[PDB]
Design a protein around this ligand. Structure first.
Ligand code: ACA
Length: 80
């Protein structure tokens, strides 16, 4: 099962697609979106490849988007 539990900071699945069906930008890529959500900045977060994560304590997993126009979105993951 690829779901999450409550806030999903726990998650470590390899779901890398947006809520709207967009590819997730890779965490360390500063293209298209430059940001500070790097493993250098969050060594415990699991800010690997381009999978949905929660380095910020948000309500659920998300990622930056490869759509230059859409900086970030929630992930297409379910609460389990
Ligand atoms: N936690 C949801 C919003 C992500 C904001 C990304 C930021 O620009 O650092």
């Amino acid at each position: 099962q690829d779901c999450y539990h409550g806030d999903g900071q726990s998650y470590r699945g390899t779901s890398s697609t947006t809520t709207t069906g967009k590819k997730c930008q890779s965490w360390s890529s500063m293209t298209p979106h430059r940001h500070q959500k790097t493993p250098e900045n969050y060594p415990n977060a699991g800010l690997t490849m381009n999978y949905c994560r929660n380095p910020d304590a948000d309500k659920g997993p998300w990622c930056f988007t490869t759509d230059p126009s859409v900086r970030w979105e929630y992930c297409n993951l379910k609460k389990c």
